[model samples]
Target: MFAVISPSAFGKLKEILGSNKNYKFVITTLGVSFAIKSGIDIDSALDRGVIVRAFSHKPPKVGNLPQYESEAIMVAFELNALLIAEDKDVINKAKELGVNAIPIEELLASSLEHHHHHH
Candidate 1:
């Protein structure tokens, strides 16, 4: 499945996405800076082909969503991807706009279980 990742969730998900090929992710340029600031290695993930480039489409502002979150929602909608966001409001807004979004906690819990059963 496709996914649009927010900066808040990026660090936590770095290894999960890198190791799992199930998701094809898109990030906003704004998200990248935050990710880098948080010590996430964007280059390696890009090199591994885990992420598509930062999307170029500029989506109009929606509700109280920040620029980065808005971009994520737009990309998710355009690509039919799930939105990965840590902000509860962003998650709610994304789902309201028909973007399937989930919080990082839920993802991590599921991933841990999935990995345990398989490995």
Candidate 2:
């Protein structure tokens, strides 16, 4: 299974879920397109399969959400995966679309509760 994530979301949480055998992180094609404009090396992760792309045949219609954010929610819906993001608009919009949305902060905080410090 996969969790659709935004680049601005919890970097550490991505690492945690990605390391689990049952889960992988995914970003939408729109996200890749936008990141390429800024020269982000997300493509490297894509090549390595550390992350993967979710194709959006049509752009999602959400109030004032950017292409990448809207696409993220749409992809998550299609995949039946969690949408992890730091942006309030993205989170709120995902919920509006009935996708399970989680904030990175809440993910990190919950992970912390069971994370034991090494001796």
Candidate 3:
């Protein structure tokens, strides 16, 4: 299954990957906000295909935040993706769009469970 993790989750993921080198990793451009907020340069992770996008504060006038969120959801859905969101509202919105959205705790637990099963 394709996994979409947030920037914070990505840091935790790095630690998990440190001792284990069996699995492959890919970063998408869509999650750039996480990198930026975490001080991880998106360019440095470019070779990893980490998706990056600019954030607009003014909001989209035509369709508004919902539209923007819908676009994000579409991207995640198309990729069979998951999102790391601390905000309950954002998570709910993503879920409403059929995107797999979870908080850090659930994500870590799920990942660990999956890894254990695979191993």
lDDT of 3 by residue, 3-118 (tens): 44444344555443333223233343445555666676555444443344333422322223344344444455556676655456657766776777777666555553445545
Error of 3 at 78 (Å): 1.4
Q: Pick the candidate with the highest TM-score.
A: 1
Per-residue C-alpha lDDT of model 1 across residues 1-119, encoded as one tens digit per residue: 78778766765666557444467767767667666777787766566555654565655668687776677777787787878888888888888878888887666655544655453
Task: Single out the weakest 10-residue window by summed lDDT for candidate 3.
Answer: 55-64
Could you tell me every candidate's TM-score relative to the true structure? 0.74, 0.72, 0.49
lDDT of each: 0.71, 0.69, 0.49
Model 2 Cα shift for residue 102 (angstroms): 1.4
lDDT of 2 by residue, 1-119 (tens): 66787665533443545343244668777677766777776655565464656673865788788777887888888888878788887888888888878887665545445766557
Better of 1 and 2 by TM-score: 1
TM accuracy, model 3: 0.49
